[PDB]
Design an enzyme around this catalytic site. Structure first.
Site, short mmCIF file in Angstrom:
data_model
loop_
_atom_site.label_atom_id
_atom_site.label_comp_id
_atom_site.label_asym_id
_atom_site.label_seq_id
_atom_site.Cartn_x
_atom_site.Cartn_y
_atom_site.Cartn_z
N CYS B 108 0.80 -1.22 0.00
CA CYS B 108 0.00 0.00 0.00
C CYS B 108 0.84 1.28 0.00
O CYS B 108 1.62 1.53 0.91
CB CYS B 108 -0.96 0.01 1.20
SG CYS B 108 -1.84 1.57 1.35
N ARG B 111 0.15 4.68 2.83
CA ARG B 111 0.30 4.41 4.26
C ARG B 111 0.71 5.61 5.10
O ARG B 111 0.72 5.51 6.33
CB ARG B 111 1.28 3.27 4.48
CG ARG B 111 0.65 1.90 4.28
CD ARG B 111 1.66 0.81 4.57
NE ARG B 111 2.63 0.71 3.47
CZ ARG B 111 3.75 0.00 3.52
NH1 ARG B 111 4.07 -0.67 4.62
NH2 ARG B 111 4.55 -0.05 2.46
N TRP B 280 -9.16 6.63 -0.35
CA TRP B 280 -9.54 7.37 -1.55
C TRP B 280 -8.63 6.89 -2.69
O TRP B 280 -7.59 6.28 -2.46
CB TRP B 280 -9.41 8.87 -1.36
CG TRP B 280 -8.13 9.34 -0.75
CD1 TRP B 280 -6.94 9.58 -1.40
CD2 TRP B 280 -7.91 9.67 0.62
NE1 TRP B 280 -6.00 10.03 -0.50
CE2 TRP B 280 -6.57 10.09 0.75
CE3 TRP B 280 -8.72 9.66 1.77
CZ2 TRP B 280 -6.03 10.49 1.97
CZ3 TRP B 280 -8.18 10.04 2.97
CH2 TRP B 280 -6.85 10.46 3.07
N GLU B 285 -5.26 4.13 -10.58
CA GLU B 285 -6.06 2.93 -10.38
C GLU B 285 -7.21 2.91 -11.38
O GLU B 285 -7.46 1.89 -12.04
CB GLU B 285 -6.59 2.84 -8.94
CG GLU B 285 -5.47 2.81 -7.91
CD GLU B 285 -6.01 2.68 -6.51
OE1 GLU B 285 -6.49 1.58 -6.20
OE2 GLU B 285 -5.96 3.67 -5.73
C1 HEM Z 1 -6.26 6.56 2.14
C2 HEM Z 1 -5.73 6.52 0.91
C3 HEM Z 1 -5.17 5.23 0.27
C4 HEM Z 1 -4.51 5.21 -0.89
C5 HEM Z 1 -4.17 6.43 -1.77
C6 HEM Z 1 -4.15 3.83 -1.17
C7 HEM Z 1 -3.47 3.40 -2.28
C8 HEM Z 1 -3.32 2.08 -2.61
C9 HEM Z 1 -3.06 1.56 -3.92
C10 HEM Z 1 -2.89 2.40 -5.21
C11 HEM Z 1 -2.96 0.23 -3.81
C12 HEM Z 1 -2.71 -0.76 -4.96
C13 HEM Z 1 -4.11 -1.01 -5.50
C14 HEM Z 1 -4.11 -1.89 -6.71
O1 HEM Z 1 -3.37 -1.59 -7.68
O2 HEM Z 1 -4.89 -2.89 -6.71
C15 HEM Z 1 -3.19 -0.14 -2.42
C16 HEM Z 1 -3.17 -1.42 -1.90
C17 HEM Z 1 -3.52 -1.78 -0.62
N1 HEM Z 1 -3.97 -0.92 0.37
FE1 HEM Z 1 -3.97 1.13 0.32
N2 HEM Z 1 -4.63 3.02 -0.15
C18 HEM Z 1 -5.27 3.86 0.76
C19 HEM Z 1 -5.90 3.46 1.91
C20 HEM Z 1 -5.84 2.22 2.51
C21 HEM Z 1 -6.53 1.82 3.73
C22 HEM Z 1 -7.46 2.75 4.55
C23 HEM Z 1 -6.20 0.53 3.97
C24 HEM Z 1 -6.61 -0.40 5.13
C25 HEM Z 1 -7.12 0.06 6.29
C26 HEM Z 1 -5.30 0.11 2.89
C27 HEM Z 1 -4.69 -1.11 2.74
C28 HEM Z 1 -4.21 -1.61 1.56
C29 HEM Z 1 -3.93 -3.01 1.36
C30 HEM Z 1 -4.07 -4.17 2.37
C31 HEM Z 1 -3.46 -3.12 -0.08
C32 HEM Z 1 -3.04 -4.44 -0.77
C33 HEM Z 1 -4.20 -4.86 -1.66
C34 HEM Z 1 -3.97 -6.21 -2.26
O3 HEM Z 1 -3.04 -6.92 -1.81
O4 HEM Z 1 -4.73 -6.58 -3.19
N3 HEM Z 1 -5.13 1.16 2.05
N4 HEM Z 1 -3.38 1.03 -1.72
C1 LIG Z 2 -7.51 -7.56 -12.25
N1 LIG Z 2 -8.82 -7.82 -11.61
C2 LIG Z 2 -9.47 -6.55 -11.24
C3 LIG Z 2 -9.06 -6.11 -9.85
C4 LIG Z 2 -8.52 -7.03 -8.96
C5 LIG Z 2 -8.15 -6.62 -7.69
C6 LIG Z 2 -8.31 -5.29 -7.29
C7 LIG Z 2 -7.89 -4.94 -5.90
C8 LIG Z 2 -7.85 -6.00 -4.99
N2 LIG Z 2 -7.48 -5.80 -3.73
C9 LIG Z 2 -7.14 -4.58 -3.31
C10 LIG Z 2 -7.15 -3.47 -4.16
C11 LIG Z 2 -6.74 -2.14 -3.54
C12 LIG Z 2 -7.34 -0.90 -4.19
C13 LIG Z 2 -7.41 0.26 -3.21
C14 LIG Z 2 -7.85 0.07 -1.90
C15 LIG Z 2 -7.92 1.15 -1.02
C16 LIG Z 2 -8.39 0.97 0.41
C17 LIG Z 2 -7.54 2.41 -1.46
C18 LIG Z 2 -7.11 2.57 -2.77
N3 LIG Z 2 -6.75 3.80 -3.22
N4 LIG Z 2 -7.06 1.51 -3.60
C19 LIG Z 2 -7.54 -3.65 -5.49
C20 LIG Z 2 -8.85 -4.36 -8.17
C21 LIG Z 2 -9.22 -4.78 -9.45
#
Ligand code: HEM
Ligand SMILES: CNCc1ccc(-c2cncc(CCc3cc(C)cc(N)n3)c2)cc1
Ligand code: HEM
Ligand SMILES: CNCc1ccc(-c2cncc(CCc3cc(C)cc(N)n3)c2)cc1
Ligand SMILES: C[C@H](O)[C@H](O)[C@H]1CNc2nc(N)[nH]c(=O)c2N1
Ligand SMILES: C[C@H](O)[C@H](O)[C@H]1CNc2nc(N)[nH]c(=O)c2N1
Ligand SMILES: [Zn+2]
Lengths: 407, 411
Positions: B108, B111, B280, B285
């Site tokens: 993430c 963070r 947000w 994304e």
């Molecule tokens: C507040 C603004 C936040 C931004 C800008 C942000 C941004 C991102 C982005 C761009 C990703 C990659 C998403 C993707 O390509 O699928 C991500 C992944 C992730 N975020 Fe954040 N996020 C935010 C908030 C949070 C919050 C509030 C949580 C949990 C309380 C969180 C936990 C995670 C986790 C666990 C992943 C890994 C997702 C996965 O493994 O599929 N994020 N974040």
């Molecule tokens: C490729 N299949 C479509 C697809 C698969 C997985 C995901 C996805 C899965 N797990 C986590 C995410 C994180 C996205 C995210 C989460 C949060 C809290 C904030 C943020 N800015 N962006 C995205 C999105 C799209």
């Protein structure tokens, strides 16, 4: 133990079995992944030689044959006797091609089997090295129709007689720290440029001065040579729509030729082994021109495009980045100099991966290096899981000469 | 042991000591790196030490390590585990745990915000209808009329694994995908299978290109139930371009609230299988992945057409050119409607500052370079040149299997 890799764009899954033959270590453990870290005796030699000769004779379908056993015998004798051994021309060519085949950071490996190998193991002096390198450059450049090549100098003996090319690439531009405080030319080469001056170079203190070669034969002190200017093919950079682009005065060289790595084959070490292919566009346009620690021209170009540089969210950097990379590709193509765009190159690599999984059972690959430095997820490699591991023959990093050389 | 990471743009070197506190495996070995691999019932036996480790961490952070309060709590949890085979977190511990799971999320980039997380305790929830209410309230709170606020809602922990709470949606808000007989797809191709499940469960599909999916909610191991999020709670943004007037006519929009709902929250050995969380969006994304992935809405072609780019040679970089304009439009549209969004330059810059801060105060910041670097323009962002160490700390968010593959249907 039999690992699967998935492409998330196409759902295609491949099974890797080649990693089981991995010898060297990754830097990683079960507790920590170092995937994004840039740099993570007679007894030792014979099993290394054996492993290599085994795969060589396997490749020519003569495993466990008379010729195989005889060669193993002969090398075994030669090691016991001479504490090293010499590769047959056939083994040298095989090893070099496979060093490239095994380079997990190289996106261009679909071409691996079409490598021109120049055997320079009879070289004894820096002037000889210069001659061999000029010939390499001329062959590889081929008037713009680039051809892959490597030139292999004598192998390390007692470590006191190393052949080294001190340059990081055969062809690169000088860098000078200004009394103005800024930097003229390529900032990445300021230290090397000083060493050239400290060794006697006469720098024209310009922005794109092709550096001299600093060549070290048989552990001797290195010597300076200027590559004949007519052998260095350069390309003026213009844009197909923006006429003002030429006034930036940008140019780059046609031949990417890495000269600071170590080639390991069957335990033998080739400390001087310059190799070359042809550029992917983003290497020049994204990294060389737009890195903050390089020529860093983003701001200048954005200004000429009259973009809003007030807010990062206008993506002015992104817009200029694309145009610059358009110009590089355009310029090379117009001057008929081989170049590949990141879309074509990455598509080629996927096809190569599938070829390698099918005919070899795998393909070691470093995602961090294989995904292009722009537009990553619209290239197919982004969605491609990769397994990274180390096979030999290999290209390895080695310490910079000035930190090692006993003068 | 000490571990150094280098930034190759700035030559800044940092030293990691936090990695010594790493427990879980990475998937890597001395002989293979699995860094680019997407995905590489608990007895009291293994539960005490996980509880103890967590509570030691908790009481350290509040500067009460070794206190009578600390010792009493360990004693209390110990007895509760050997008596009931599990234990309950105090509210304070739950909030701490959830914040730290985010803090520890190595993929993430957002963070820097980890300490400002609104934690909604839904551990008293017992039915799908109750889950729906809690999720509506989360969506309304997080959305805040476009001024987004990070939040997480935590439903009851796993017990025997036969009574799991689950949100079957991968995200709280997502568009339906419909596979057509001719093989084409209407809507979001990523959600075709889930859409079909919803339809099978009785959802009447409008069959448009941007239909908000119903919630499919499972409480206490029962069969999941369908709920429609009130449309007035789903904030959406029409996508237009600041210079290209034809862009609006592409008919694109997206929802404002990214809310992940399929992951498992692990705290002190306890497993929260339903824990939707939201922040947000970062612009890319939507503009890079959602719109431009070949396996998603895939609009690079039409946009490039309308721009009249040269589309015969890939070396014209027409794909790259279109990609940038789309991402400009996404940011422009959100900003114009005053819905919180961050560009990839700002977000990566903030993450580097966060990361450096974490090294100094925490001794590390686990990070997954493969996920942290944005899907466009990678090396003109500061994270590209930043060496990162990836390791797994708890509390954590983990993947879990899709519920439709594991659920035992009651009928
Ligand atoms: C507040 C603004 C936040 C931004 C800008 C942000 C941004 C991102 C982005 C761009 C990703 C990659 C998403 C993707 O390509 O699928 C991500 C992944 C992730 N975020 Fe954040 N996020 C935010 C908030 C949070 C919050 C509030 C949580 C949990 C309380 C969180 C936990 C995670 C986790 C666990 C992943 C890994 C997702 C996965 O493994 O599929 N994020 N974040
Ligand atoms: C490729 N299949 C479509 C697809 C698969 C997985 C995901 C996805 C899965 N797990 C986590 C995410 C994180 C996205 C995210 C989460 C949060 C809290 C904030 C943020 N800015 N962006 C995205 C999105 C799209
Ligand atoms: C012919 C076309 C070729 C293309 C398009 C190509 C492309 C690339 C690219 C883009 C990189 C990333 C390096 C960087 O960004 O600094 C790379 C790395 C590398 N290439 Fe290839 N290459 C080609 C030929 C070759 C040849 C002929 C060899 C060896 C005989 C080779 C061996 C390597 C090695 C060892 C690396 C890792 C370099 C390092 O670690 O610094 N390549 N290549
Ligand atoms: C801040 N870092 C600056 C910098 C870092 C690394 C390099 C670099 C040094 N040596 C080799 C490379 C690989 C480039 C390459 C080699 C070959 C054979 C083909 C090709 N297309 N591209 C790149 C240049 C500059
Ligand atoms: C195979 C590869 O790991 C996969 O495509 C990853 C790459 N990096 C990513 N990075 C982010 N933020 N999100 C993703 O889905 C992915 N996908
Ligand atoms: C720290 C990070 O590993 C470093 O910036 C890497 C990332 N990926 C790269 N990829 C290529 N092709 N070349 C590079 O020099 C780098 N640098
Ligand atoms: Zn690893």
């Amino acid at each position: 133990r039999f690992l699967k890799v998935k492409n998330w764009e196409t759902d295609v899954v491949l099974t890797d079995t080649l990693h089981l033959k991995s010898t060297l270590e990754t830097g990683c453990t079960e507790h920590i992944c170092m995937g994004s870290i840039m740099l993570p005796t007679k007894d030792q030699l014979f099993p290394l030689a054996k492993e290599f000769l085994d795969q060589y004779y396997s490749s020519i379908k003569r495993f466990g044959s008379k010729a195989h056993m005889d060669r193993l015998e002969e090398v075994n004798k030669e090691i016991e006797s001479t504490s090293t051994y010499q590769l047959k021309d056939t083994e040298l060519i095989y090893g070099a091609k496979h060093a490239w085949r095994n380079a997990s950071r190289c996106v261009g490996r679909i071409q691996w089997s079409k490598l021109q190998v120049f055997d320079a193991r009879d070289c004894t002096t820096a002037h000889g090295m210069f001659n061999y390198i000029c010939n390499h450059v001329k062959y590889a450049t081929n008037k713009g129709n680039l051809r892959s090549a490597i030139t292999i100098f004598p192998q390390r003996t007692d470590g006191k007689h190393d052949f080294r090319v001190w340059n990081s690439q055969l062809i690169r531009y000088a860098g000078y720290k200004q009394p103005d405080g800024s930097t003229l030319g390529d900032p990445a080469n300021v230290q090397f440029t000083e060493i050239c001056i400290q060794q006697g170079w006469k720098a024209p203190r310009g922005r794109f001065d092709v550096l001299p070669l600093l060549l070290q034969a048989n552990g001797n002190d290195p010597e300076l040579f200027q590559i004949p200017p007519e052998l260095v093919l350069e390309v003026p950079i213009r844009h197909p729509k923006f006429d003002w682009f030429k006034d930036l005065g940008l140019k780059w060289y046609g031949l990417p030729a890495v000269s600071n790595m170590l080639l390991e084959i069957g335990g033998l070490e080739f400390s001087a082994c310059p190799f070359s292919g042809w550029y992917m566009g983003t290497e020049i346009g994204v990294r060389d021109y737009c890195d903050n620690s390089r020529y860093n021209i983003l701001e200048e170009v954005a200004k000429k495009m009259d973009l809003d540089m007030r807010k990062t969210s206008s993506l002015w950097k992104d817009q200029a980045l694309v145009e610059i990379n358009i110009a590089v590709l355009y310029s090379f193509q117009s001057d008929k100099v081989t170049i590949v765009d990141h879309h074509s190159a990455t598509e080629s690599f996927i096809k190569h991966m599938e070829n390698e999984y099918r005919c070899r059972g795998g393909c070691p690959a470093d995602w961090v290096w294989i995904v292009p430095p722009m537009s990553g997820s619209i290239t197919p490699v982004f969605h491609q899981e990769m397994l990274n591991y180390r096979l030999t023959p290999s290209f390895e990093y080695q310490p910079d000469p000035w930190n090692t050389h006993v003068w």
